[PDB]
Amino acid sequence: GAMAEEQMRLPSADVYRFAEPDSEENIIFEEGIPIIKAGTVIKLIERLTYHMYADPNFVRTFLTTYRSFCKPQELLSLIIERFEIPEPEPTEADRIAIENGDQPLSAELKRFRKEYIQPVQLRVLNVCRHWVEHHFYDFERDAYLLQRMEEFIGTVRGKAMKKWVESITKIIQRKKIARDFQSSPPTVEWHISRPGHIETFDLLTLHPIEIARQLTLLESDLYRAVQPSELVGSVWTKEDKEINSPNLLKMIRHTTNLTLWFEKCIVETENLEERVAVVSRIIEILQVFQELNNFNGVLEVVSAMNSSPVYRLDHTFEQIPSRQKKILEEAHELSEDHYKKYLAKLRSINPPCVPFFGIYLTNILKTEEGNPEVLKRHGKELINFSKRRKVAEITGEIQQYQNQPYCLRVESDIKRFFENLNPMGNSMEKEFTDYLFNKSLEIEPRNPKPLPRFPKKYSYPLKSPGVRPSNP
Numbered sequence: 001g002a003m004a005e006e007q008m009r010l011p012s013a014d015v016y017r018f019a020e021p022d023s024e025e026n027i028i029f030e031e032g033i034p035i036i037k038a039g040t041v042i043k044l045i046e047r048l049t050y051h052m053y054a055d056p057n058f059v060r061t062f063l064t065t066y067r068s069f070c071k072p073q074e075l076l077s078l079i080i081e082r083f084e085i086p087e088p089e090p091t092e093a094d095r096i097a098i099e100n101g102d103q104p105l106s107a108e109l110k111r112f113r114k115e116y117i118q119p120v121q122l123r124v125l126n127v128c129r130h131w132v133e134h135h136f137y138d139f140e141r142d143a144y145l146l147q148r149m150e151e152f153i154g155t156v157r158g159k160a161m162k163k164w165v166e167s168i169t170k171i172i173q174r175k176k177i178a179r180d181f182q183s184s185p186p187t188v189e190w191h192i193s194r195p196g197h198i199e200t201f202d203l204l205t206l207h208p209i210e211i212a213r214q215l216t217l218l219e220s221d222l223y224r225a226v227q228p229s230e231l232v233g234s235v236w237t238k239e240d241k242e243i244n245s246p247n248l249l250k251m252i253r254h255t256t257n258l259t260l261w262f263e264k265c266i267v268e269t270e271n272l273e274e275r276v277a278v279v280s281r282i283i284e285i286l287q288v289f290q291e292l293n294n295f296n297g298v299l300e301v302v303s304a305m306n307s308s309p310v311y312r313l314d315h316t317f318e319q320i321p322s323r324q325k326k327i328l329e330e331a332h333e334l335s336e337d338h339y340k341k342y343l344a345k346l347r348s349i350n351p352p353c354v355p356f357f358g359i360y361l362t363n364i365l366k367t368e369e370g371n372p373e374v375l376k377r378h379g380k381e382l383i384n385f386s387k388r389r390k391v392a393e394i395t396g397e398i399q400q401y402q403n404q405p406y407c408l409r410v411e412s413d414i415k416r417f418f419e420n421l422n423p424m425g426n427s428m429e430k431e432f433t434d435y436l437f438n439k440s441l442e443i444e445p446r447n448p449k450p451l452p453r454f455p456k457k458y459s460y461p462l463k464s465p466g467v468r469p470s471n472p
């Protein structure tokens with residue numbers, strides 16, 4: 001019948017793998033273009049290059065997420081296999097015409113070329129273009145993968161294929177070339193340390209406004225460099241994390257380094273009055289982070305203030321001004337009830353901002369851990385694509401804030417200072433944080449023991465210059 005007529009117009013399974021009929025054993029849809037819930041990799045590749053219609057949502061989501069279920073080398077082999085569509089044999093009447101040296105009618109052959117082969121081949125090249133355009137890092141990390149792509153693209157022949165080959169070749173060239181303000185920004189603020197005097201640069205010697213600005217610029221650049229694929233499949237926690245998630249790992253290491261540096265600054269200031277000044281100055285840095293909508297920065301300070309060594313320092317926070325304590329308390333409350341107030345704040349403000357990154361890693365980990373890699377139907381494993389789409393939706397939220405530059409002048413020496421923070425030294429984190437906690441017990445012992453006094457370490461004025469910028 002008509003079903004067998006349609007299916008037999010496609011190539012048979014012995015000469016081509018991407019034309020088997022749809023069924024429950026190889027593909028599932030979600031409850032318009034159908035939304036793919038699960039399927040075998042061969043069915044996902046078929047639908048990624050589907051003859052009947054374009055599917056940009058699926059193409060975008062696939063090329064973001066595919067590394068969780070398919071290697072780059074393997075993907076290129078599959079789409080090249082997909083591309084190589086065999087043509088049907090001539091009809092009996094046309095076989096006779098070819099036998100006599102005459103031109104065959106080739107009515108069905110021409111229809112198959114028109115309505116199946118050319119569309120699929122164009123879809124394969126659309127995937128190739130999207131691949132090199134938005135995920136060129138695959139080809140940077142694997143030179144052999146690029147050699148295969150350029151050999152494939154370079155041997156494509158046809159009238160309708162010429163324009164696609166040239167645009168793909170043009171994009172590949174631009175990505176190699178790249179590989180090798182709006183308004184007036186405010187005046188760079190200084191306090192004790194002079195411009196160029198990098199030896200004197202420290203928490204209390206630099207201006208707190210300028211610390212916040214330069215950290216916001218640093219954290220903005222780190223935020224914007226993270227690609228969606230660096231988060232997919234929890235690859236930042238696997239053994240190839242350094243190659244797969246370099247920008248994410250850099251952001252995490254900065255957060256760890258800054259947060260522990262704040263803790264180190266506080267608890268290695270053994271004098272009570274000086275430690276109050278240190279804590280007060282870090283709160284001022286938080287207030288300027290808040291002014292700049294650097295929520296990453298705000299919650300880095302909250303993390304440092306809530307840590308085991310700092311949070312217990314009752315005598316230090318006793319002397320902190322009530323207004324600063326209120327600001328600290330409101331910063332904390334951003335995280336309560338699964339970050340409800342933070343998300344409300346994030347939605348309400350105007351750009352530019354730097355979102356809190358940690359929340360994306362939490363929700364991705366829960367999505368990765370909470371959903372199965374495969375769905376089973378009749379003893380066959382199908383790749384759980386809905387899982388990948390949900391992860392891709394979270395990385396989509398990251399990307400909407402990744403084009404918000406700050407109107408703030410970079411200061412190279414202050415940037416270097418914060419880029420090169422190494423509070424742990426040779427120690428590992430766990431042992432260093434144990435050291436931090438043991439320091440807290442020394443400077444402020446538990447209730448049975450009294451509070452000893454400690455000498456001053458700072459030889460310069462401790463009074464803050466404040467958080468309001470120079471506008472007299």
Ligand SMILES: COc1cc2nc(C)nc(N[C@H](C)c3cccc(-c4cn[nH]c4)c3)c2cc1OC
Nearest residue numbers: 302305306307311317325328329330331332333
């Ligand atoms: C449930 O346990 C906590 C409650 C908190 N509730 C507020 C309102 N704020 C916090 N943290 C802020 C950032 C904080 C940190 C350090 C000191 C202070 C503070 C405020 N006043 N006095 C001390 C406040 C909190 C930290 C908690 O566990 C570490």
